[PDB]
Amino acid sequence: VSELAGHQTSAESWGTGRAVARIPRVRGGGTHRSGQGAFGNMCRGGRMFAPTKTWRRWHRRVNTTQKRYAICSALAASALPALVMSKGHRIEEVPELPLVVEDK
Amino acid sequence: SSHKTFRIKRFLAKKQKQNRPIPQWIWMKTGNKIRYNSKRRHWRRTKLGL
């Protein structure tokens, strides 16, 4: 979410008295958005709580030996008969489950 | 002001021609989204700025 979302509006709080809920409201004007409430996550429009940043830790690195262990386990379970059907593959008519074909 | 200038009179002349409503054939088109003229300025309600 953009950093300017909610902060483009200038809104000073009305203070106390006025019997309003002590919220930064839009500074005057003969329109619908005048004394309405701009800042805060709970107001209509404005900003939300915790704007998602571009510098979130999106990427996770794995050790090379763990990557190779995952490859070896994913290849070794592709030879067992029950684990392939438990993935869901219809393999009833396949003549051999380590299906090795020619170089053509 | 009866003592007008040419620039102010031309500025009022454009608004007097903008004050007219829409025709009746404009809402017979395909992609119409205009029911009426929403920019109708009345001489008591909106005082044209200045």
Binding site: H32, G35 | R45
Partner: peptide, 24 residues
Amino acid sequence: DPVPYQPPFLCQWGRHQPAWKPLM
């Protein structure tokens, strides 16, 4: 007619108003 502005503030109950005062 445009949106009417909010009912204005009027110093109604300050030190200046003798119609109501608290214990001083």
